[PDB]
Amino acid sequence: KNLGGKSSGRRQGIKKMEGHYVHAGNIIATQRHFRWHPGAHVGVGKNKCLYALEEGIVRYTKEVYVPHPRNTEAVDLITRLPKGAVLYKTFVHVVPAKPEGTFKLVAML
Amino acid sequence: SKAVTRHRRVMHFQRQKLMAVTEYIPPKPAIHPSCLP
Amino acid sequence: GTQRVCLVHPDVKWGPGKSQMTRAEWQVAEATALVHTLDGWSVVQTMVVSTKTPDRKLIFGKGNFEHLTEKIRGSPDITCVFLNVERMAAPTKKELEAAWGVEVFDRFTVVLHIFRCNARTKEARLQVALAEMPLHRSNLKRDVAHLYRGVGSRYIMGSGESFMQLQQRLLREKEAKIRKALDRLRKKRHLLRRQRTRREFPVISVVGYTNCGKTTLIKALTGDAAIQPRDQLFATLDVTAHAGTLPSRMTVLYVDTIGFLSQLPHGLIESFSATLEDVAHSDLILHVRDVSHPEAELQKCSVLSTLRGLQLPAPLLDSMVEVHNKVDLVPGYSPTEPNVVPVSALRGHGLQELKAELDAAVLKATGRQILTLRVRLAGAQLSWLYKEATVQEVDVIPEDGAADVRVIISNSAYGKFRKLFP
């Protein structure tokens, strides 16, 4: 009577924990729902996977959640929130390590 | 056998030893109070 | 078990089984009450199907049977089918169960279930096992190919106990053990009555159809508040004796019995054995009829047929006092047939007249003699008579030292008195 349910695990979750050096483009965490939200220098794919937009150190923090005003469901949740209440979410940041570049003497004209 | 059984499940010998060692020992009041004034 | 029942009532038209006295609506109402009795399930669907050959294996014709099985299989909510056909034969039950995909119950099986589920007696359990012994086609709702070839094939030149041989052996052994246990329980029930018989208590069996008010009548007669009549069918499960006092100051046992049912093998119900043997050994039979019920004639016919089949003594059949209960329900009622006492058990209208009537009946039946006897005072003759015989009246002659006592005394007690105090 019970059919299906044979699907294997997605192997989703965090691929880079805090303090891990991460290169640009590396996937930090794969998730089905928004468990960890994108922080600074972290981009989201179509499937909600978080990838490092810069080369640096991954840091997980708790930050206030301010959704986009056009996110109707979240805006409604906020509108129903009592005064003084602030939503918090777990954000993943990539603290860039190297500088954008250096100025080098190329020609002594 | 499940952890919860309708009968008293047999304990592993080390657990049995642990229970016997950690049995309650009442305080012996030296001289029995019954025959003290 | 929270079952869902389809009540299939074969309405017999023409030929044997055609009921002139009762109607299909009444019979299906009776079946609905029967199934409600068990506290577990209720009728989800009811179908009255015309049938002209009730004696055939399938009861119904080919077209009607196909139509019935069509609905039964189409409707999934049904868990079982109750066939208001008294008793089904084993082949009929097998065919109907296979066709309809669910367990099929008849009146006999349903009553056995009432006894087992309500009166959880060993008699009922053993009777259910006895009736359940025929066991094949375990997986209903589907015909299962089996291919039993090669199981227990000959090893050298012979084979061990095969299937349908082991089944036969188990069937025979189980039947024997159930019968032996039932015999033991019957012997114990007989043992229970030895002291009562020795004390020679006049014993009266109240018999009648279910819900006629046997329990209520016994409550009214005895005055016992512990007796609790109920509106449920087969409420008075198990047989019990209650003491009561008659206007002649006599003590009499009323045997509250299990109510009888129409279209039911009472002799083959083991739980009814106590009732049947108690009415057999009863000194008088009190036939309670609920004249208010529309099916009164059918109920009387069924009860009388059961009593006749019991092969009771001719004097016991005769003098059976008939009491028409529930007379208050009928606004104005007049008993046309003589020698019937109209009473209202709840309202206690004709109870005094009934008491006098069956008091005379007991005096006739038990053989006790009403007589005036002279006893010398201080002899303890008077105390002995007080204990061993009912004492209607006492008149002491102050001068003589004797007393004339009007007493109803049995032959045994009279002989004992004459010998003990010549």
Place this chain on the structure above:
Amino acid sequence: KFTRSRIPEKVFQASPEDHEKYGGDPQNPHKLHIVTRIKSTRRRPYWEKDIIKMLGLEKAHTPQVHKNIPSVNAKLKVVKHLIRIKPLKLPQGLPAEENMSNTCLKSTGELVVQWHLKPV
């Protein structure tokens, strides 16, 4: 499921009664542990086996000297049910290069720096 055991911190907080019983002052703690494997690693988890190998306690009843520092203490806490831990005592102080070849670890836990094998 059977898993690695997390010992609550309160277990390793000595009391004054324990100090009196075992003769160790909370101030000025001992520097080195003498550790002896008194129990087999057989029938014990692979992690305990590995910790024993790391501590170098493969041979039973063979004393080994270890630092009394938090990390070594953590390993010893992991495998504490298989080992006997005692404080290394130096009645004559640390052995010098001159007497490095005359040392002996007495059963009391004292590393005497002179071993004459003669009656006192």
Place this chain on the structure above:
RNA sequence: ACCCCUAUACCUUCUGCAUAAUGAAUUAACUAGAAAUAACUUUGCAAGGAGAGCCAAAGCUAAGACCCCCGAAACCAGACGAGCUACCUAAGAACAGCUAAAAGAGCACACCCGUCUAUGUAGCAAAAUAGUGGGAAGAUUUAUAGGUAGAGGCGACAAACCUACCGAGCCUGGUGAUAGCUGGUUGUCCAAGAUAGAAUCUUAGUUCAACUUUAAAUUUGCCCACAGAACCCUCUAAAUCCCCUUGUAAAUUUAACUGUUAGUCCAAAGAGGAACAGCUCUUUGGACACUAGGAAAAAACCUUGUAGAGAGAGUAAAAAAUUUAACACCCAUAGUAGGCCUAAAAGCAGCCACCAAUUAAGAAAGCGUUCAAGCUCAACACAAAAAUCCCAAACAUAUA
């Protein structure tokens, strides 16, 4: 010499064998690992090597070194078979006696057959003997010669018979058929070595992973401090991941491979079953498929493991404890037989009131009475049982 103490043949197979699972009487002899690719080692020559061809961005050339045995029912081709048997062809032979009368007639010999019983069962016999029985002038039996041949013949169809074993003969050959299946696989010694899964006409197998082995290159491998890893869900576990130190010495990568991918119990979290199974299925860990000691014997419990000799020593785990049911003695008047109720129901059949006096007593906490009467209480005083035969012997007291 035996007596003493210790010791559960071997091989194969298996989760696990003394196993009452396989093989083996024993001796002698015979009887079973064939090889490419790519690598590794060692030479030679060297941007070239090689005795045309081929390879080459250190290669090329040469050598060394890894790949078993027996076993089917089968399939097909060509021969050989009808001296047995099935049927037929030619031309022959036999059938006493009695009853009946020109008979697919009866009894009954010879003769043919083989109903039933016994014996026999490596027998006298690879189908018999003794008795018994069916037919015995016919569709009979039978001698001789001939014919029908296997994708076939023949058949009063019993899948009968076709040279003792016909669901389709036998021989030879293809053929050393093939077998994921069973069995076997022969000198010494050391070392490493039991690991998730996926796919599969696939779960008796195989390939890839994982594990394992070898060699080589390199540098981090394991343990692990904070900090850190989600809401749903109100609470919500043992833990885990990550992880510098630290204690350690391993790890990753490169090259070449096999074998294991049919598993048991124990502790723990669970699921199914019946909170059964020495049951089944996952997960963490342990042990076993290796040594030794212990729990009696003992794969899985406990102790302990790295190997030798010793007629030394300290130890590890390691021996079950329980024996259980007494109990008050005295005394009871009472307004009245509290009312109603009932034939009477009077503490004591039912309901309501349920007070009150005597020093002290519930309009009575239980028996009894037809109803009463009579006897008491509160109140005064004073654990287990089964089938061959129980199962070490015994012991309560000499200093842990």
Place this chain on the structure above:
RNA sequence: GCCUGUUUACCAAAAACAUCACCUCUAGCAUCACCAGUAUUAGAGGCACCGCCUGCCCAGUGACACGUUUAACGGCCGCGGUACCGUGCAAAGGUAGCAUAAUCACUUGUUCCUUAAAUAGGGACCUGUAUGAAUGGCUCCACGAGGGUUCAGCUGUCUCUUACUUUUAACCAGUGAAAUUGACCUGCCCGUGAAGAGGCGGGCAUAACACAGCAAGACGAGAAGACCCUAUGGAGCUUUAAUUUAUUAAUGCAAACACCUGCAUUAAAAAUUUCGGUUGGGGCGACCUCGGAGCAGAACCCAACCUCCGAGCAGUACAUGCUAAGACUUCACCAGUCAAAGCGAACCUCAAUUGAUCCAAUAACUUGACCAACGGAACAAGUUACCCUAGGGAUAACAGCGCAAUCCUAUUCUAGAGUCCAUAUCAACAAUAGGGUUUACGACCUCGAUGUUGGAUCAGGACAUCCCGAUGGUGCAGCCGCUAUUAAAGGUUCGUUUGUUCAACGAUUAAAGUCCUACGUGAUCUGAGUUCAGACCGGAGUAAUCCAGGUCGGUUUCUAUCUACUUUAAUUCCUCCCUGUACGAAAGGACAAGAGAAAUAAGG
């Protein structure tokens, strides 16, 4: 079954096959069968003498025709009303006959006869929705080593065995095998254990060897189990399984002027090959791929014929374009994911929502399988008991073993039965224990065999006692009883049907016990039942063949090497009397004591 005959040589002799008779179909003809024959003939068949008959149906399939045919395959009903009055449907609604049948089950149908007693037999039935008419139906004369029943007689079949002769046997002499055999210095009990020990643990026993018997064990010898499963192992047979028509026969078209050849089409006959997997053994049923949620609370990953939900799209867009760092990855690979920057532009939603290679279509771009057995053979089903081989105790049936759901037993509870009264005897809801007799469930030993129902024979053991003994209670007046404690020394019947173990019945008994012992015991016996080979009936299927349906028949091996063993104060009934006494109102009716008789068992 008409009969005489025939058949599985070597387990079935039969009811099976044939058979006269009847009937169906086909054929208008000669120089090798038919046949040296010619429609009263020949061949292919069905059924089965005879007697009465053989009913209705051509809708479907087949065949023949261009609609016919059932003595071709085959089929031959319902509904509503109260048997007949109407109606639906069909091709026709099973007609005559017979009927518990050799005819699914119910089944030991219900009756009468038969017997003391009958699951047997015979005669009957409002007896079959699974009887039934040349898939032949009834009747019947004869006949049968056919299958049942039976009168009478007969008898050692048996009650109940004994005696003797011969053979065998044992001893002496001559000659002289066979399977078997790891080695054996080869005991019993209990426990253990690979779940049944001569070898292991604890006990007990124990000089040594012969000879003759016995068959409880050596899971004894024997045949690499024929039962069951598995193998991408076979083969036989059937088809309406897949692929073909090479071959024949027809036709049509060519070619040649009917034959021959080539090409097609249709049949007949065949040929080759297959008959998935999982699976609490196999089968049936269900399932096979993908996604979400629990189991799996917290990085990841986790099984289940476990619990639940869903998917095999849809919508919007036409940059839903091109490129490219770095990463993830369903534990392999295949496949699947995310994506910075850049070019070119503007200024995808969705959990699943799918499928490789080859090969086809296309100019190309691209498209193609509910290949769902979803990592996908390009295309193949049944059945086998006529079976075969290789294995498997990896896997079922018997047995053992685990367990105790089921089963059985005992206590606790104090509601309720018991006129009153829980406990004389019981007992609901429940609780706590014990046992290992059942049905299971598990699949641990055994498939290079552990022979497995019932019976005979002999029995060993338990007591949870049926009888005999003692004892307490009783709703124990006596007689019968009921219940409980103790007791296993001894005993525990003969018959009818039935294979029955059992059951019923007949007659008894003091009683006619419940069990265990491989449901004791087949190297002691029997095989009646029982899913080997033959055959019939009913049913299923197109057929082969099949049915835990019936029924008739059907090969019972072993010379003993080892262990073990082979001469170890009795119960009960009845008769009289007590005694018509005690007891009892009567009905009835005892003990104890005493006397006498027997029956069985043991030994002579």
